[PDB]
Amino acid sequence: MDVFLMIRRHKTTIFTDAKESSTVFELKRIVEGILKRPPDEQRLYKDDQLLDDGKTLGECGFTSQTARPQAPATVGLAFRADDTFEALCIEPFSSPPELPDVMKP
Amino acid sequence: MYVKLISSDGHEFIVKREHALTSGTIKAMLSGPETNEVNFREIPSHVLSKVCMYFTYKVRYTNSSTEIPEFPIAPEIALELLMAANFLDC
Amino acid sequence: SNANPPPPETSNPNKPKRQTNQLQYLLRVVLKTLWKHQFAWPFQQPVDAVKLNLPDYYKIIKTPMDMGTIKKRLENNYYWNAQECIQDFNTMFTNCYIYNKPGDDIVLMAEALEKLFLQKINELPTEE
Amino acid sequence: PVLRSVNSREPSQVIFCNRSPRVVLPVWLNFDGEPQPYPTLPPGTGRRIHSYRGHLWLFRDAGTHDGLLVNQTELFVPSLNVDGQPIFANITLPVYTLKERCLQVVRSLVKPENYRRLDIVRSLYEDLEDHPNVQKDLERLTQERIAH
Numbered sequence: 001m002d003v004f005l006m007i008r009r010h011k012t013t014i015f016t017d018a019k020e021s022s023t024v025f026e027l028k029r030i031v032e033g034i035l036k037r038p039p040d041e042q043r044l045y046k047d048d049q050l051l052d053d054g055k056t057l058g059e060c061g062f063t064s065q066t067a068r069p070q071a072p073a074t075v076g077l078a079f080r081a082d083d084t085f086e087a088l089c090i091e092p093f094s095s096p097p098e099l100p101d102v103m104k105p
Numbered sequence: 106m107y108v109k110l111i112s113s114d115g116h117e118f119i120v121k122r123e124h125a126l127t128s129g130t131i132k133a134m135l136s137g138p139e140t141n142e143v144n145f146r147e148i149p150s151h152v153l154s155k156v157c158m159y160f161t162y163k164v165r166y167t168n169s170s171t172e173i174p175e176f177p178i179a180p181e182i183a184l185e186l187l188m189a190a191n192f193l194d195c
Numbered sequence: 196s197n198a199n200p201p202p203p204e205t206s207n208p209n210k211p212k213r214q215t216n217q218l219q220y221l222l223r224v225v226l227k228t229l230w231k232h233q234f235a236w237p238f239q240q241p242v243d244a245v246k247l248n249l250p251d252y253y254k255i256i257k258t259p260m261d262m263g264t265i266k267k268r269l270e271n272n273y274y275w276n277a278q279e280c281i282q283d284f285n286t287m288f289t290n291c292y293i294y295n296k297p298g299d300d301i302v303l304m305a306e307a308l309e310k311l312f313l314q315k316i317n318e319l320p321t322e323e
Numbered sequence: 324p325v326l327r328s329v330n331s332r333e334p335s336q337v338i339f340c341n342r343s344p345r346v347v348l349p350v351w352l353n354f355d356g357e358p359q360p361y362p363t364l365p366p367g368t369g370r371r372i373h374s375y376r377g378h379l380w381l382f383r384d385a386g387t388h389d390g391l392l393v394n395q396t397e398l399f400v401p402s403l404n405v406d407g408q409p410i411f412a413n414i415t416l417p418v419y420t421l422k423e424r425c426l427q428v429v430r431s432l433v434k435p436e437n438y439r440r441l442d443i444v445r446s447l448y449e450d451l452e453d454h455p456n457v458q459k460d461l462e463r464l465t466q467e468r469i470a471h
């Protein structure tokens with residue numbers, strides 16, 4: 001069962017799909033292919049919760065009904081920074097303008 | 106496999122090239138006798154993240170014999186999203 | 196007894212003609228809204244019981260009524276007042292509920308037109 | 324007219340099934356090609372209907388006239404029931420283009436008299452005002468049938 005994700009770190013967002021039976025490690029391998037950092041230099045997160053490499057995405061709480069193509073689930077990414085991992089930091093996107101009055105109920 | 110689409114505010118969006126080809130404009134920009142990166146000086150990140158979500162939705166649900174869900178658009182992003190869809194031709 | 200009878204009269208020299216602001220509202224607002232409704236099409240003309248193969252239609256329905264007759268009546272100043280016109284819309288709906296089985300697709304269309312009709316009629320101006 | 328029902332009088336049971344998040348307006352094209360809307364179906368509901376062989380149907384969003392799909396196409400014509408089995412008409416949302424989906428959302432929030440008060444380009448005003456409708460779609464489906 002496919003889960004649609006946004007792997008985010010700072011101002012980087014990876015859009016990728018994966019199975020519920022696929023592991024957190026398999027997702028780190030996707031990240032290494034794109035962002036050229038090895039799995040041991042990555043930390044994956046669901047909210048502020050660090051995910052274990054051997055856990056399947058489904059075991060982590062990522063379900064098909066909650067990780068849809070049109071509304072993907074967010075997986076936080078933190079890279080190694082010398083002898084310590086950097087603090088998880090996802091930069092938010094820009095803000096839309098104030099809703100025009102001709103669009104208000 | 107992937108392309109980087111950079112919003113006007115510097116956010117990077119890495120999507121499958123096949124998905125980004127959902128845009129007729131991106132498909133033409135990447136066409137011709139490759140370019141793995143596209144900047145959009147006029148599309149902000151709140152709009153470009155939503156366009157990327159639509160790419161995933163279009164590829165997943167096009168030609169599928171499973172019922173299609175609605176692509177959701179909040180009122181706050183609707184006008185800017187409309188302007189981006191019109192430019193991107195998707 | 197199949198052949199359709201002559202349609203209802205829409206003009207009579209011996210019946211008093213009349214125009215009020217309520218009868219103008221019933222034509223320009225009520226009838227116009229209902230005539231353009233997506234479910235107006237089975238009610239714009241007298242039921243062609245012959246072509247439609249409707250058994251005992253004119254045997255069961257003694258006072259046939261349709262929106263074409265009401266429209267022509269409104270246009271000819273046939274009615275004395277709004278209530279005379281409203282009675283004709285009610286008869287058109289009641290005819291449908293009597294002849295057809297509760298739950299049929301025609302009965303659902305009549306129920307949507309009637310719900311709309313009552314809403315419009317709820318804003319009938321006071322006669323001035 | 325090319326797009327019309329055939330007056331067959333050969334009964335055919337059909338199952339209209341609304342598998343879209345919209346309220347469906349089933350539209351029957353009569354013997355003269357005219358669209359004759361039938362009672363609506365709320366999202367996730369279905370109903371058996373007494374229809375006929377050769378009868379032509381299309382499905383629309385009851386409130387906005389957005390086009391819907393039936394059996395992954397635009398039109399539906401039932402065949403004769405093989406062994407009493409009904410014919411299924413599965414109605415779903417199409418994968419609209421992002422621009423048509425955005426026009427749908429703006430139309431749902433803005434009254435048509437306020438379209439020209441939106442801070443969008445001039446050509447987007449003409450697109451908002453070009454509301455989807457059965458007559459517009461019937462001409463296109465007729466022009467495709469002539470080619471094919």
Ligand SMILES: Cc1ncsc1-c1ccc(CNC(=O)[C@@H]2C[C@@H](O)CN2C(=O)[C@@H](NC(=O)CCCCCCCCCCNC(=O)c2cc3c(cc2CS(C)(=O)=O)-c2cn(C)c(=O)c4[nH]cc(c24)CN3c2ncc(F)cc2F)C(C)(C)C)cc1
Pocket residue numbers: 236237238240241242243244246247249290291294295299300301330332351361372373374375378
């Ligand atoms: C008989 C029965 N046995 C056992 S189960 C059963 C049964 C039959 C139908 C249905 C509902 N399945 C349908 O509807 C289907 C769906 C789609 O395939 C169309 N189709 C039909 O059946 C059509 N048949 C046929 O092609 C076979 C017969 C061909 C007749 C050729 C001549 C037809 C002239 C066409 C123009 N004229 C209309 O279109 C029209 C239909 C209509 C009323 C008024 C008009 C205008 S007019 C000529 O009178 O000026 C009508 C009005 N009023 C006030 C009533 O009270 C009625 N009571 C019954 C009817 C009416 C018949 N009717 C109608 N009925 C149901 C509707 F939902 C909508 C309707 F408009 C029509 C719409 C014509 C009935 C359910 C059960």
